[PDB]
Design an enzyme around this catalytic site. Structure first.
Site, PDB file in Angstrom:
ATOM      1  N   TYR A 222      23.092 -56.025  46.723  1.00  0.00           N
ATOM      2  CA  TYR A 222      24.188 -56.746  46.124  1.00  0.00           C
ATOM      3  C   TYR A 222      25.112 -55.849  45.330  1.00  0.00           C
ATOM      4  O   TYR A 222      24.751 -54.732  44.928  1.00  0.00           O
ATOM      5  CB  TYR A 222      23.690 -57.829  45.184  1.00  0.00           C
ATOM      6  CG  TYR A 222      23.003 -57.377  43.904  1.00  0.00           C
ATOM      7  CD1 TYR A 222      21.625 -57.120  43.903  1.00  0.00           C
ATOM      8  CD2 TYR A 222      23.748 -57.212  42.737  1.00  0.00           C
ATOM      9  CE1 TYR A 222      20.990 -56.672  42.744  1.00  0.00           C
ATOM     10  CE2 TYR A 222      23.116 -56.766  41.578  1.00  0.00           C
ATOM     11  CZ  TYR A 222      21.748 -56.493  41.607  1.00  0.00           C
ATOM     12  OH  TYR A 222      21.161 -56.023  40.473  1.00  0.00           O
TER      13      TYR A 222
ATOM     14  N   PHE B 201      30.268 -54.910  37.704  1.00  0.00           N
ATOM     15  CA  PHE B 201      29.396 -54.830  36.547  1.00  0.00           C
ATOM     16  C   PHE B 201      27.995 -54.392  36.969  1.00  0.00           C
ATOM     17  O   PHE B 201      27.212 -54.020  36.094  1.00  0.00           O
ATOM     18  CB  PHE B 201      29.317 -56.148  35.739  1.00  0.00           C
ATOM     19  CG  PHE B 201      28.800 -57.355  36.522  1.00  0.00           C
ATOM     20  CD1 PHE B 201      27.431 -57.540  36.742  1.00  0.00           C
ATOM     21  CD2 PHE B 201      29.708 -58.233  37.095  1.00  0.00           C
ATOM     22  CE1 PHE B 201      26.988 -58.559  37.582  1.00  0.00           C
ATOM     23  CE2 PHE B 201      29.247 -59.264  37.909  1.00  0.00           C
ATOM     24  CZ  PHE B 201      27.891 -59.428  38.168  1.00  0.00           C
ATOM     25  N   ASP B 202      27.618 -54.468  38.254  1.00  0.00           N
ATOM     26  CA  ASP B 202      26.286 -54.081  38.675  1.00  0.00           C
ATOM     27  C   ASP B 202      26.233 -53.953  40.185  1.00  0.00           C
ATOM     28  O   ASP B 202      26.952 -54.675  40.858  1.00  0.00           O
ATOM     29  CB  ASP B 202      25.259 -55.107  38.172  1.00  0.00           C
ATOM     30  CG  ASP B 202      23.786 -54.724  38.330  1.00  0.00           C
ATOM     31  OD1 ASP B 202      23.472 -53.615  38.753  1.00  0.00           O
ATOM     32  OD2 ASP B 202      22.922 -55.543  38.046  1.00  0.00           O
TER      33      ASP B 202
ATOM     34  N   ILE C  83      20.017 -66.951  39.231  1.00  0.00           N
ATOM     35  CA  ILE C  83      21.057 -67.921  38.903  1.00  0.00           C
ATOM     36  C   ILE C  83      21.283 -68.933  40.027  1.00  0.00           C
ATOM     37  O   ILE C  83      21.139 -68.601  41.214  1.00  0.00           O
ATOM     38  CB  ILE C  83      22.411 -67.238  38.535  1.00  0.00           C
ATOM     39  CG1 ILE C  83      22.980 -66.280  39.570  1.00  0.00           C
ATOM     40  CG2 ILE C  83      22.285 -66.618  37.168  1.00  0.00           C
ATOM     41  CD1 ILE C  83      24.339 -65.730  39.138  1.00  0.00           C
TER      42      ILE C  83
ATOM     43  N   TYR D 187      26.122 -67.729  34.270  1.00  0.00           N
ATOM     44  CA  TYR D 187      25.641 -67.597  32.910  1.00  0.00           C
ATOM     45  C   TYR D 187      26.380 -68.494  31.928  1.00  0.00           C
ATOM     46  O   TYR D 187      26.141 -68.469  30.722  1.00  0.00           O
ATOM     47  CB  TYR D 187      25.608 -66.112  32.468  1.00  0.00           C
ATOM     48  CG  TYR D 187      24.699 -65.286  33.373  1.00  0.00           C
ATOM     49  CD1 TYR D 187      23.315 -65.308  33.200  1.00  0.00           C
ATOM     50  CD2 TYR D 187      25.257 -64.521  34.389  1.00  0.00           C
ATOM     51  CE1 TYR D 187      22.493 -64.532  34.023  1.00  0.00           C
ATOM     52  CE2 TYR D 187      24.439 -63.756  35.233  1.00  0.00           C
ATOM     53  CZ  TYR D 187      23.066 -63.756  35.024  1.00  0.00           C
ATOM     54  OH  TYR D 187      22.283 -62.971  35.818  1.00  0.00           O
TER      55      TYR D 187
ATOM     56  N   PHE E 205      30.037 -61.886  44.039  1.00  0.00           N
ATOM     57  CA  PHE E 205      28.951 -61.049  44.458  1.00  0.00           C
ATOM     58  C   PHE E 205      29.111 -60.816  45.922  1.00  0.00           C
ATOM     59  O   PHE E 205      29.450 -61.753  46.650  1.00  0.00           O
ATOM     60  CB  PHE E 205      27.598 -61.729  44.300  1.00  0.00           C
ATOM     61  CG  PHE E 205      27.068 -61.688  42.889  1.00  0.00           C
ATOM     62  CD1 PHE E 205      26.290 -60.600  42.465  1.00  0.00           C
ATOM     63  CD2 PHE E 205      27.357 -62.726  42.010  1.00  0.00           C
ATOM     64  CE1 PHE E 205      25.836 -60.545  41.139  1.00  0.00           C
ATOM     65  CE2 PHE E 205      26.881 -62.673  40.694  1.00  0.00           C
ATOM     66  CZ  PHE E 205      26.130 -61.580  40.247  1.00  0.00           C
TER      67      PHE E 205
HETATM   68  C1  RAP Z   1      18.099 -53.924  36.056  1.00  0.00           C
HETATM   69  O1  RAP Z   1      18.445 -54.900  36.961  1.00  0.00           O
HETATM   70  C2  RAP Z   1      17.956 -56.168  36.739  1.00  0.00           C
HETATM   71  C3  RAP Z   1      19.005 -57.114  37.336  1.00  0.00           C
HETATM   72  C4  RAP Z   1      20.227 -57.304  36.454  1.00  0.00           C
HETATM   73  C5  RAP Z   1      19.902 -58.223  35.277  1.00  0.00           C
HETATM   74  C6  RAP Z   1      21.153 -58.720  34.548  1.00  0.00           C
HETATM   75  C7  RAP Z   1      22.181 -59.318  35.478  1.00  0.00           C
HETATM   76  C8  RAP Z   1      23.451 -59.626  34.687  1.00  0.00           C
HETATM   77  C9  RAP Z   1      22.426 -58.413  36.688  1.00  0.00           C
HETATM   78  O2  RAP Z   1      23.310 -57.411  36.205  1.00  0.00           O
HETATM   79  O3  RAP Z   1      21.229 -57.892  37.240  1.00  0.00           O
HETATM   80  C10 RAP Z   1      23.001 -59.178  37.895  1.00  0.00           C
HETATM   81  O4  RAP Z   1      23.657 -58.578  38.753  1.00  0.00           O
HETATM   82  C11 RAP Z   1      22.710 -60.528  38.145  1.00  0.00           C
HETATM   83  O5  RAP Z   1      23.451 -61.362  37.602  1.00  0.00           O
HETATM   84  N1  RAP Z   1      21.790 -60.914  39.056  1.00  0.00           N
HETATM   85  C12 RAP Z   1      20.785 -60.003  39.605  1.00  0.00           C
HETATM   86  C13 RAP Z   1      20.852 -60.162  41.120  1.00  0.00           C
HETATM   87  C14 RAP Z   1      20.502 -61.604  41.508  1.00  0.00           C
HETATM   88  C15 RAP Z   1      21.412 -62.576  40.776  1.00  0.00           C
HETATM   89  C16 RAP Z   1      21.502 -62.335  39.283  1.00  0.00           C
HETATM   90  C17 RAP Z   1      20.262 -62.880  38.611  1.00  0.00           C
HETATM   91  O6  RAP Z   1      19.976 -64.050  38.821  1.00  0.00           O
HETATM   92  O7  RAP Z   1      19.424 -62.102  37.745  1.00  0.00           O
HETATM   93  C18 RAP Z   1      18.291 -62.559  37.098  1.00  0.00           C
HETATM   94  C19 RAP Z   1      18.766 -63.112  35.738  1.00  0.00           C
HETATM   95  C20 RAP Z   1      19.156 -62.008  34.781  1.00  0.00           C
HETATM   96  C21 RAP Z   1      17.711 -63.942  35.044  1.00  0.00           C
HETATM   97  C22 RAP Z   1      17.465 -65.395  35.379  1.00  0.00           C
HETATM   98  C23 RAP Z   1      18.534 -66.350  34.820  1.00  0.00           C
HETATM   99  C24 RAP Z   1      18.267 -67.825  35.176  1.00  0.00           C
HETATM  100  C25 RAP Z   1      16.825 -68.298  34.883  1.00  0.00           C
HETATM  101  O8  RAP Z   1      16.481 -69.430  35.680  1.00  0.00           O
HETATM  102  C26 RAP Z   1      15.757 -67.265  35.269  1.00  0.00           C
HETATM  103  O9  RAP Z   1      14.607 -67.671  34.636  1.00  0.00           O
HETATM  104  C27 RAP Z   1      13.503 -67.669  35.476  1.00  0.00           C
HETATM  105  C28 RAP Z   1      16.104 -65.836  34.851  1.00  0.00           C
HETATM  106  C29 RAP Z   1      17.424 -61.326  37.058  1.00  0.00           C
HETATM  107  C30 RAP Z   1      16.719 -61.059  38.372  1.00  0.00           C
HETATM  108  O10 RAP Z   1      17.362 -61.129  39.423  1.00  0.00           O
HETATM  109  C31 RAP Z   1      15.222 -60.701  38.326  1.00  0.00           C
HETATM  110  C32 RAP Z   1      14.769 -60.215  39.690  1.00  0.00           C
HETATM  111  C33 RAP Z   1      14.392 -61.915  37.948  1.00  0.00           C
HETATM  112  C34 RAP Z   1      14.009 -62.259  36.710  1.00  0.00           C
HETATM  113  C35 RAP Z   1      14.264 -61.413  35.467  1.00  0.00           C
HETATM  114  C36 RAP Z   1      13.241 -63.565  36.422  1.00  0.00           C
HETATM  115  O11 RAP Z   1      13.251 -64.415  37.566  1.00  0.00           O
HETATM  116  C37 RAP Z   1      11.755 -63.394  36.025  1.00  0.00           C
HETATM  117  O12 RAP Z   1      11.342 -64.668  35.683  1.00  0.00           O
HETATM  118  C38 RAP Z   1      10.838 -64.664  34.412  1.00  0.00           C
HETATM  119  C39 RAP Z   1      10.821 -62.933  37.141  1.00  0.00           C
HETATM  120  O13 RAP Z   1      10.006 -63.703  37.648  1.00  0.00           O
HETATM  121  C40 RAP Z   1      10.889 -61.476  37.577  1.00  0.00           C
HETATM  122  C41 RAP Z   1      10.786 -61.380  39.100  1.00  0.00           C
HETATM  123  C42 RAP Z   1       9.780 -60.726  36.883  1.00  0.00           C
HETATM  124  C43 RAP Z   1       9.806 -59.214  36.943  1.00  0.00           C
HETATM  125  C44 RAP Z   1       8.650 -58.770  36.089  1.00  0.00           C
HETATM  126  C45 RAP Z   1      11.139 -58.745  36.362  1.00  0.00           C
HETATM  127  C46 RAP Z   1      12.066 -58.096  37.035  1.00  0.00           C
HETATM  128  C47 RAP Z   1      13.361 -57.761  36.441  1.00  0.00           C
HETATM  129  C48 RAP Z   1      14.266 -57.163  37.210  1.00  0.00           C
HETATM  130  C49 RAP Z   1      15.623 -56.908  36.709  1.00  0.00           C
HETATM  131  C50 RAP Z   1      16.588 -56.314  37.391  1.00  0.00           C
HETATM  132  C51 RAP Z   1      16.420 -55.739  38.804  1.00  0.00           C
END
Ligand code: RAP
Length: 116
Positions: A27, A37-38, A64, A90, A108
């Protein structure tokens, strides 16, 4: 739905993800003014999943709302553009610590690499 999807490259049209599945995705996200932004798309190597595409389970709220719903309409291979209203991303507060301004509509490009 509060997203808009334009298909940019057609997938296989056979393998779609269901609410169960784990999706593997590349993405790039841009803000309204065009600044990316990413991205996870990599210029050092793709190779081999170095670095690795994003993985999560669809339909279960790991990502999201815009992404969760749009991934369900994509087939394997598909690159698509997604404009997601703030309500399905968000929202009012945005996510300041992660570069997301309040009430940002977000664009995206997403590519479905694999589903299992
Ligand atoms: C450095 O890169 C980050 C990604 C960044 C974070 C901040 C955002 C700006 C962003 O810049 O990406 C971005 O581009 C973004 O907006 N994205 C990421 C790409 C998919 C869409 C969106 C998103 O939903 O992010 C997500 C957003 C930030 C959070 C959600 C918001 C809505 C709410 O319903 C959800 O609660 C469940 C959380 C981040 C993710 O895509 C990651 C994969 C998933 C999570 C963190 C949560 O689902 C968590 O649940 C607890 C999990 O079960 C995960 C798998 C547990 C493991 C240990 C953690 C992995 C963390 C990986 C983080 C990564 C690669």
């Amino acid at each position: 739905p509060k997203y808009t999807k334009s298909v940019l490259k057609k997938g296989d049209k056979t393998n779609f993800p269901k609410k169960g599945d784990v999706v593997h995705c590349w993405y790039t996200g841009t803000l309204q003014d065009g600044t990316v932004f990413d991205t996870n798309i990599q210029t050092s190597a793709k190779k081999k999943k170095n670095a690795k595409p994003l993985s999560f389970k669809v339909g279960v709220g790991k990502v999201i709302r815009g992404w969760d719903e749009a991934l369900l309409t994509m087939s394997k291979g598909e690159k698509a553009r997604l404009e997601i209203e703030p309500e399905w991303a968000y929202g009012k507060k945005g996510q300041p610590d992660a570069k997301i301004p309040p009430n940002a509509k977000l664009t995206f490009e997403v590519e479905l690499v694999d589903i299992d």
